[PDB]
Each structure stands twice: as C-alpha cells, then as structure tokens.
Amino acid sequence: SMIKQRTLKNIIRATGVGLHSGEKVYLTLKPAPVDTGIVFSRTDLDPVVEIPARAENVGETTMSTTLVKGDVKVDTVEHLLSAMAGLGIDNAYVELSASEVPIMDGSAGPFVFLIQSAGLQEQEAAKKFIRIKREVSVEEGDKRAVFVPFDGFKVSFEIDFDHPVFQQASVDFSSTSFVKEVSRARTFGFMRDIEYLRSQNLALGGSVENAIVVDENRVLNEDGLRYEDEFVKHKILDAIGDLYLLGNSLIGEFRGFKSGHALNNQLLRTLIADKDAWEVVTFEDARTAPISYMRP
Numbered sequence: 001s002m003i004k005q006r007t008l009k010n011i012i013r014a015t016g017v018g019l020h021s022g023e024k025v026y027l028t029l030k031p032a033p034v035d036t037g038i039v040f041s042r043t044d045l046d047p048v049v050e051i052p053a054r055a056e057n058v059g060e061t062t063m064s065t066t067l068v069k070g071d072v073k074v075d076t077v078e079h080l081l082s083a084m085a086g087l088g089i090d091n092a093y094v095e096l097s098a099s100e101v102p103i104m105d106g107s108a109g110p111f112v113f114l115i116q117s118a119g120l121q122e123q124e125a126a127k128k129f130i131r132i133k134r135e136v137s138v139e140e141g142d143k144r145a146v147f148v149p150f151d152g153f154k155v156s157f158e159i160d161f162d163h164p165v166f167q168q169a170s171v172d173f174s175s176t177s178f179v180k181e182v183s184r185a186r187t188f189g190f191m192r193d194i195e196y197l198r199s200q201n202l203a204l205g206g207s208v209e210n211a212i213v214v215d216e217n218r219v220l221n222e223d224g225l226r227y228e229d230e231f232v233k234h235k236i237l238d239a240i241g242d243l244y245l246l247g248n249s250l251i252g253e254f255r256g257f258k259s260g261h262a263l264n265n266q267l268l269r270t271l272i273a274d275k276d277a278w279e280v281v282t283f284e285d286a287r288t289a290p291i292s293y294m295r296p
C-alpha cells in the first residue's frame, strides 16, 4: 500500500538548443537507484561533472535557474525539473552534452511526453515528502514568496506586467491535471528586450518555436496562446521546477507575488534552514495519503 519512489523504465533521448546559449545540446535521461534524487551530468567534460539538482548547488538566478560546481554550470533546469516534479519522478540521471538544458517548445510538454512514452518504474522504497509545518515567507521590495501548511499540494501566482497584452492563477493538484493544465504553458519574452539581451549573449536560442514573443500590443506567434492565462501558468510551471530543488515532492501550499528564480531560491534556503517549519514524511498506505499519482 506504500507510496513508492519512481524512476524511468527506459532511457529518454532528446536533441535541442539552449534558450540563452543557442548551443545544440544532446539530453539523455537514465534510471537511477533509490534515494539518488535528480542529478545533472556534463558528459562533454572529462572527467564528467555531476551536480545534484538541490538548492545548495544553485548559482546564477537572473536568466533562469542555474546549477554550479566550481567553474562548471548547467543553465535553465526549471522546465525539466517541473516535468519531473509533475510526474512524481524521484531518481534520475540527466546527461547533457553542453551547459544548457534544451528549451524544446518553451514548456514542460515535450519532456512530459518523452518521459511518459518511456514509462516510469516504481522502486521498492517509500517516497519521501517535505511537509510544510509552519508558514515561511520571504519578501524583497514588492515581491513575496510564501510556503503555507496544507494537506495536499497547491500553487498560487500573481504577476503584474504594465503591458496591454497582460495575471493571477491557482492550481490544486487534487483537481488540476499538471499534464493538461500546466505542462504546456510556454516561456515568454518582450520583443523590446531582445536586441539588448543578445548583446549580453542571452536569448541567443530564442524563436517563435520555443517562446511566446510579445510586441508593443500583440503576441507575434501566428497560432497565439495555448491557455487564456498562459503567462501566469508558465510562472506556476517555473515555481514547481524551482520547488523541486528541495529534492522531494512537497506537502504544502506555495504563493508567489511577482516572484522569480532569485526569491524562490531565497524561500527554499529559508525553509531548509528553519527545521521547525518542515519534516520528511512517508505514506505506508496510499489510501490515507493527502496526494495521489497517476499509474506509472
């Protein structure tokens, strides 16, 4: 009856381009043993460099969520971690032939499809959850990020863009399908920012194929938006990926108010440090647990 740890049944292979670097990258996801967690691996280097996807290894925060070990990095991990969090994958090796995870279509959709095509394997070990026991909030100017105790998993987000195209959403995975309602929400950029970003060697891989591109007054993508609230749904997708840097699925509520990688990482560090605010729990009977997972 216990909720078991999950890994991949079969390896996943993908080729793509880094959003910021524009570099061609080969991605391989491999099964991993019980209690490995998600571990990134730069296989272009000799020796190979491995970085656990944990809050302690987060470096750069500006462009995206970056993992760092000395002078080696793995850029833009948050969409793949969102896919792994959404499908309840505990243990996996992520091999990359370059510094940036491929952007694919700008959402978690392609990763979720490749993973669910390969299938998941339950492992003979209790899945560990981080349960929020006390409210933890971080603020910086007008931005806020909060964990609240909650017997389940739910995420609220609010952005405020002073832009004609542009803003609040709430998901509770007691009803919301991660796969149908969140995973397909794409990243977005303002056309006004692109020349500047290029000069700072950012958005080099950006195109209408992997991002909602916003001009003065309209989305420029011919086929438009996947969801009326795609922009804030993408912030929820990013938040789920950043939360998975705790290294286990959450039993609790997350609320974001104009937050991003930086303040989300400050929230994880504050939670981890306040051991009164959380505990590791397992469920020896799935029937009495406050969360459930799709068949593997």
Ligand SMILES: CC(C)C(=O)N1C[C@H](NC(=O)[C@@H]2C[C@H](F)CN2)C[C@@H]1C(=O)NCc1ccc(C#Cc2ccccc2)cc1
Binding pocket: 063, 064, 065, 076, 078, 186, 187, 188, 189, 190, 194, 197, 203, 205, 206, 207, 208, 211, 213, 234, 238
């Ligand atoms: C407004 C901006 C500061 C912001 O607040 N957020 C919040 C969201 N952040 C994410 O989605 C994170 C960071 C990373 F984008 C992946 N996860 C989305 C947007 C963001 O950073 N866009 C990054 C981004 C930048 C540029 C192009 C182009 C492009 C392009 C398109 C056509 C031709 C040439 C270039 C896409 C995207």
Ligand SMILES: [Zn+2]
Binding pocket: 078, 079, 187, 234, 238
């Ligand atoms: Zn994103």
